[PDB]
Design a protein around this ligand. Structure first.
Ligand code: SF4
Ligand code: SF4
Lengths: 887, 887
């Protein structure tokens, strides 16, 4: 129950009321006479929007200082008025001066200085004298209404006077609220002569005495203004609200009755007939539109802490949406509104009385509601409880009044309630779930390898591409992936058994992506060498490269033509080994990466498998050692923090190949032609004695099998390391392997990730997002985005991989970037490589997320970090920032 | 010396030559008949730009597959031609089909399929039959010229035939190169009848047989075309280049002579007179423009590895810029061009012959040049040596030919050579500099506190603000900083002795910035309490808050009015302690934060000083413990990694206040009204026994003094922790305190930061950037941006602080955001808080960097991480990405 004095240790100052009633006026200068704390940290905070000069959104302050406090601040206000009038001529029609606590203490007379400066300026000055300490926000509202009636109403006559004029009193146009009801008011004939304190011109506001009916939306702020206008002008008021459908229907019907009283009689029911016609048509359409949302929003519990008239109206609206109220409490409302809400408040719903944070926490922990529709104060206090929240206040950024506003309200309610993140957040944490679920998750991770391998390519509802001319191919050569994995080995250069031209566009692409040199030497093959036998060139190139650069190991990969005429690299390898025994000490790893076999991902997987099957040998079972085979999707930073996470549990990680140290970008003391930085051959040889194997890519599964049978280690697989659900499984596997509990830093990062998820899920709801990436880095991004609310319009894959059908999206198919812009229609986010920028230019989608390879137009792509809890937080924040910027 | 066969173990395939001569044609379809590696990783890579349909930038591939290789690929090409003609009707006038190595091996006849499909389409088909293996890029260039002459030249007549027509042969319009010479050619009367293979329409290209003079820029690619056109049409050629001023002058003079020969006689010197007039005027203007750059670019050494005609021309241009050549080697050039360059090559300059990476490294280590102007291959090979580099190739993104192009060339040369990052990068690293410099740097850090404190505010050339009406104030209440520092203490809520309205807009601002709840309770003071004595309310509020929330410590901060009437909080504190001895166990910290005293920074510093002077007590000198007083500018992530860096050296860090754990955003198991997460009172009490004190803010210096005399610990200060120069000093201080060498991870991160600096300095050169931030976070950003090349147009400070004059910028002053948009004119980057977004909307500056407080429109601001080597890398990458996006 409202109890309008106060006890020390909630209601703001009277300046807050003055600004909440006067700031929404657009083309005026709101000069605040006082120190910083009054206007320094409060300007541009009001949720009022406008389609006008937008002069109100900028804040004006006199900047009360040291000397002028003990001398006087009237002269500073004089200069401020004069300068603001002179400089902002043509953009300001009036200006409001607000008295503050310090101004009142100093004895500054706002009225006197305003009268003194009035004669010297052509812009009217309104002396709002509302010191902050004189009361709560209600005193400020009343004083603002007083000054509005005294100095604004009754000064100019309207140029056009519609035969049915009404005044909107108490509506402040928060996030387009006014623009939802305005299309209804002029459609049926009424003219909004003056909408008070919202999207309102000052001259437009001075027309309010020539109307015939007043509509009071917020009773709390401007009821005294309505009463005084009734007393002085014979203007009947009407207390209604526009939040809902039945409430708006009743409001419009009452408006029609009171309009038909004042102009003509109730007989010749001119207004009522059109009001009923519009009501019937628009209500039928709105119900048809709202039906799909109610089914998903039926039976959910609700608790509301809303101050003003919304408390009465929203309870109706929620009740017609298909939800019931468990608790309802208001701090900022009239006693009549409280009693009316209590009348609406059904039994078994208890009215809150403690409006403080402690009382709110009590009622939230007691009622245990699903959704809480409350104010800005209880905004983050309810998110910490991990329950859906909807904000209906100045900070709200959506229109909720009117029929279209009600549709938007239901959309936002479904956005915040049915988000797929709430069950994940409410799930039991790794540090407290009992041991049987830990073993089940560990066994699931262990068997993920065979689950991925067993899935057949034939039974796949995603379609085999059947395009002849593909334009803008997002695929890359598998030789690119072979070179990528070869660069991850310390002191080694890659020998491309190709045609000397494939060396270009492979070295060049990697150089433009990672911004680092690539060696990538090639054995030149001309037309003469293509005919007869092509394995002379392999021996010649091996001899030349060993005699020139002296590598300790050589990686040989095949190109398209070398598979077209089908020379076996291994026979040339054994021949070269036999002819020159002096080169026995330098091993060679050969991997078949034909160009019809797929894209960078398969090439990477195949060369990793070739490395695994050849170099390491089975020995002892030294515990505390784990072997990680990173996928092609992980950037060097991801591999570096995979190493960091492995070291956190005390385990010794061996990463094969080590992209994190070679292609990350490092200025060593001396530049060498070979690729240095990766894992040495001793480490890759001793990696076969590890106690466990982890692979962070689906395509790596086969490689894991290649080490399961050769040495005997158990394998563990994770298709992604993002989304707080896969990172948890990674933590479980790491804890099981190491045998020690998760460190505290990971618990802290999980808490931070939860806080990021709760504070950012509003921008990830029902956003149409398209993704066009490789076989991997597409599952990760799709599962992360679809796991946060966004529905994937199209998940376009570079090549066919196992488990593509399980992705949550409308359609999955394999296609180029042409499929991307022919399928990204009506989408706001594109997740594709940099080369897809053209598609954005064709569709006007300004939100492009650079993922995968290649990314050349954005620097730091190789350092892009999206692994673990911290990487998940970084990706979430980047995507949320893109959503905020593009809209 | 060029040596046009090749040895296995550089020249690309013939398809690269075909594309380098044919791809720059804009409105054609470049269908590549082959597997992925030919066009999958090469499309949209050519540097040719256009002002036309831009159909060339998208790549077309037939996608040779498994079965069709062993069956046949002609039918796939047939379908591809048909589909591309049907779908892209209206955007394509012609289309080129390229034969690849796999296509040639399979025996596919491009000519036969093109002839078969010609009758069924209205778009001409050009069968470019250049298999990759048949030779190097030169064979591809010759074959492309052959097919251009055979199938393009001599098919249609020009609609308009200027009396002086010329053909531009061998110019490909790399980054607006053509658009620098085009304004000169039509100004003096000549008509460019056909510019070959650059910004050229196909129909426009078929007009080339009706000209009278040929200009050959690149002799290597299209000299055979010029010779054949001379043989078949009587068209004299002219081998010149347009890189330079004297070279362009000679080219234009020769053009005038050869034009006056063919149309009329040399007598009536119509062309020569206007050519000489334009040459004189434009050369005088260009020399006047170029003079300022030569002074900064005089005497610098240079080494060039450029392939084509640029080798001859740029040597001239560089020589006229004021630099000399130490070594010059070309791989892709004619023997005549090589001999001509050698003739230009002065003595003591030795021509390189080994064009491989090893030879380039040899010559770079031997000559030791300052600047290297070389190709895309040697791009990152020369950046690792830490020497300035300028790219003149397809990857170059600037026009360098013509007079305006030469001005741009000098601008880019000065950008890459005189960057202030090269001396920093070449400076000796922390792990190798000897001990006297280590001691000097440590002593400088120790004395930084007194250096900052000793600087007087009176001797400061930055100006005392003298504005009456300040609009859009970027300042915040010092009570905001007091609350910020109070939130960093575990299990404590802040009591605001104010007027119950300042509680709003302080709690609300922090809540909108950090997206976390703020307790911030206030002792309500009305008009009656303002008169008489206001210290009854302090006792009442303290009693209420202690009896309700039961805190273990209470932070009391004063507001503006409480200083206007001047009640002493401490007398009320002692009175409250006396009246209720039961509350003895709960200490209270009081800090005077009046609202005329400054902004958030000073409030934070003052409350930190109040906490330091009261809670801790001097005890033992337990080694290995360090005390860190973070500044108000550091976000929670910065404090968290300050802790991480301190723990890396084995030191135990005590952070006061601990923002990194309270306001970072964490979903704890239970929501409490008090602010939890910070440092406990036991830790803050035992922090007085540390072996060293570190402060990361200038304003914190006084606080450090407050702990220097109370306990006796030496102090160390760092005004910033970004830029690789201050992080180094931080590492030196940490190593000196701990007594152990820097770990390897920091060395790796320093190498990565160096690589980021070398690869991103091109976007930070001569970029006009404006900064409007607090006293701190402005020195850091200004020193980082000015330390990377950008010149600061205006460094606008929220309030006057010590050492403001030393910032590198044109003008420093204290002002609001109005000063920001009145001073950010002609700037491309704005570094200000989120509330300055309006200024961007007024100036069209789309690159806005959200720094400082408040930042509400971008999520994750509190997690924004700009500390240490990794934070410096993150900030560098974010700023570079903004520069790339906004331009
Ligand atoms: S296959 Fe032939 S044409 Fe294609 S990239 Fe390799 S060398 Fe060049
Ligand atoms: S000084 Fe007075 S008017 Fe200003 S914010 Fe505080 S209570 Fe409100």
């Amino acid at each position: 129950a409202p109890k309008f004095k106060s006890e020390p240790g909630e209601r703001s100052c009277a300046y807050d009321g003055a600004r909440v009633v006067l700031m929404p006026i657009t083309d005026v200068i709101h000069l605040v006479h006082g120190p910083i704390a009054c206007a320094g940290n409060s300007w541009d905070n009001r949720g009022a929007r406008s389609s006008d000069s937008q002069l109100y959104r900028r804040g004006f302050t006199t900047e009360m200082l040291e000397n002028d406090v003990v001398f006087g601040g009237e002269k500073k206000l004089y200069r401020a008025i004069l300068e603001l009038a002179e400089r902002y001529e043509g953009q300001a029609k009036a200006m409001f001066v607000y008295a503050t606590c310090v101004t009142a203490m100093t004895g500054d007379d706002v009225e006197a200085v305003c009268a003194a400066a009035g004669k010297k300026v052509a812009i009217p000055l309104i002396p709002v004298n509302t010191p902050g300490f004189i009361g709560d926000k209600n005193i400020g509202n009343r004083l603002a209404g007083e000054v509005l009636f005294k100095h604004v109403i009754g000064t100019a006559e309207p140029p056009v006077l519609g035969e049915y004029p009404i005044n909107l009193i108490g509506e402040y146009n928060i996030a387009g609220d006014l623009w939802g009801m305005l299309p209804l008011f002029e459609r049926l004939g009424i003219q909004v002569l003056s909408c008070f304190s919202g999207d309102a011109t000052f001259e437009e506001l001075r027309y309010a005495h020539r109307a015939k009916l007043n509509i009071i939306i917020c009773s709390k702020s401007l009821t005294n203004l309505a009463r005084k206008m009734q007393k002085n002008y014979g203007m009947p008021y009407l207390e209604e609200s526009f939040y809902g459908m039945t409430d708006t229907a009743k409001a419009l019907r009452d408006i029609a009755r009171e309009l038909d009283d004042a102009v003509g009689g109730l007989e010749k029911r001119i207004m009522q007939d059109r009001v009923e016609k519009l009501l019937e048509e628009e209500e039928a359409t709105c119900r048809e539109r709202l039906a799909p949302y109610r089914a998903r929003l039926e039976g959910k519990r609700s608790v509301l802490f809303t101050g003003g008239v919304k408390t009465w109206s929203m309870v109706n609206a929620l009740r017609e949406l298909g939800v019931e109220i468990l608790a309802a409490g208001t701090q900022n409302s009239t006693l009549e509104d409280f009693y009316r809400m209590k009348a609406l408040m059904h039994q078994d719903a208890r009215i809150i009385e403690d409006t403080s944070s402690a009382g709110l926490l009590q009622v939230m922990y007691d009622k245990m509601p699903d959704l809480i529709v409350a104010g800005g104060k209880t905004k983050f206090l309810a998110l910490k409880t991990k329950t859906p929240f909807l904000d209906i206040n100045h900070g709200r950024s959506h229109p909720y009044a009117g029929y279209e506003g009600m549709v938007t309200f239901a959309k936002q309610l479904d956005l915040t309630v049915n988000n797929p993140i709430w069950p994940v957040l409410n799930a039991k944490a790794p540090w407290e779930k009992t041991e049987e679920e830990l073993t089940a998750a560990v066994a699931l991770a262990a068997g993920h390898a065979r689950a991925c391998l067993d899935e057949d390519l034939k039974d796949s509802t995603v379609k085999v591409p059947a395009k002849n001319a593909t334009v803008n191919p997002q695929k890359n050569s598998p030789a690119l992936g072979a070179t990528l994995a070869y660069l991850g080995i310390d002191q080694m250069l890659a020998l491309l058994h190709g045609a000397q031209g494939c060396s270009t566009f492979i070295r060049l692409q990697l150089s433009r992506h990672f911004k680092e040199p690539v060696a990538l030497n090639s054995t030149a093959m001309s037309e003469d060498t293509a005919i007869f036998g092509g394995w002379e060139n392999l021996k010649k190139g091996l001899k030349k490269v060993i005699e020139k650069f002296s590598p300790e190991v050589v990686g040989v990969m095949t190109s398209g033509l070398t598979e077209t005429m089908g020379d076996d690299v291994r026979s040339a390898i054994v021949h070269f080994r036999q002819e020159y025994p002096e080169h026995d000490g330098v091993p060679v790893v050969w991997a078949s990466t034909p160009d019809y076999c797929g894209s960078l991902q398969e090439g990477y997987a195949a060369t990793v498998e070739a490395i695994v099957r050849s170099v390491p040998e089975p020995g002892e079972t030294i515990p505390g050692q784990v072997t990680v085979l990173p996928g092609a999707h992980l950037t060097p930073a991801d591999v570096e923090e995979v190493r960091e996470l492995c070291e956190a549990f005390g385990l010794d990680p061996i990463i094969v190949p080590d992209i994190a140290n070679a292609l990350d970008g490092h200025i060593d003391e001396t530049v060498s032609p070979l690729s240095t930085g990766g894992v040495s051959m001793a480490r890759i040889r001793q990696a076969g004695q590890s106690a466990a194997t982890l692979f962070i890519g689906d395509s790596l599964a086969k490689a894991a099998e290649a080490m399961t049978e050769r040495c005997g280690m158990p394998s563990y697989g994770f298709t992604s390391l993002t989304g707080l659900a896969q990172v948890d499984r990674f933590m479980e596997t790491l804890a099981a392997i190491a045998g020690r509990p998760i460190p505290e830093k990971f618990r802290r990062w999980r808490s931070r990730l939860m806080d990021a998820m709760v504070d950012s899920h509003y921008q990830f709801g029902l956003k149409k997002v398209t993704v066009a990436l490789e076989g991997d880095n597409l599952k990760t991004l799709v599962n992360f985005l679809a796991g946060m609310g966004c529905e994937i319009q199209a998940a376009i894959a570079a090549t066919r991989v196992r488990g593509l059908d399980g992705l949550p999206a409308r359609d999955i198919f394999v296609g180029d970037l042409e499929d991307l812009e022919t399928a990204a229609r009506g989408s706001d986010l594109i997740v594709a490589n940099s080369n897809g920028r053209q598609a954005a230019a064709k569709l006007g989608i300004k939100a492009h997320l650079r993922a995968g390879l290649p990314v050349f137009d954005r620097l730091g792509a190789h350092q892009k970090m999206w692994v673990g809890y911290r990487g998940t937080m970084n990706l979430l924040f980047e995507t949320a920032n893109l959503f905020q910027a593009n809209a």
